[PDB]
Amino acid sequence: SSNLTEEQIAEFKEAFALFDKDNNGSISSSELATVMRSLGLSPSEAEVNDLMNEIDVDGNHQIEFSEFLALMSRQLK
Numbered sequence: 171s172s173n174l175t176e177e178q179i180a181e182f183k184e185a186f187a188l189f190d191k192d193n194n195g196s197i198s199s200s201e202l203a204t205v206m207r208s209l210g211l212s213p214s215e216a217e218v219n220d221l222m223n224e225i226d227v228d229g230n231h232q233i234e235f236s237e238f239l240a241l242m243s244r245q246l247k
């Protein structure tokens with residue numbers, strides 16, 4: 171769309187939680203990995219930690235909502 175900010179953030183917040191299976195405002199390797207495991211992929215730490223890392227602004231084996239917004243921010247249009 172052409173309007174994000176609080177609009178994209180709010181939408182992301184709901185999505186972030188989806189990734190975190192504990193709602194602790196934080197996501198670990200498996201946490202973000204369970205987002206595709208139930209679909210039919212069962213990725214290994216390599217792919218699991220990869221996702222959590224690609225967004226881990228600090229690099230602590232997990233990412234927080236705000237971090238999910240830094241890497242998320244849509245992708246193309």
Ligand SMILES: [Ca+2]
Nearest residue numbers: 190192194196
């Ligand atoms: Ca958590």
Ligand SMILES: [Ca+2]
Nearest residue numbers: 226232233234
């Ligand atoms: Ca983090």
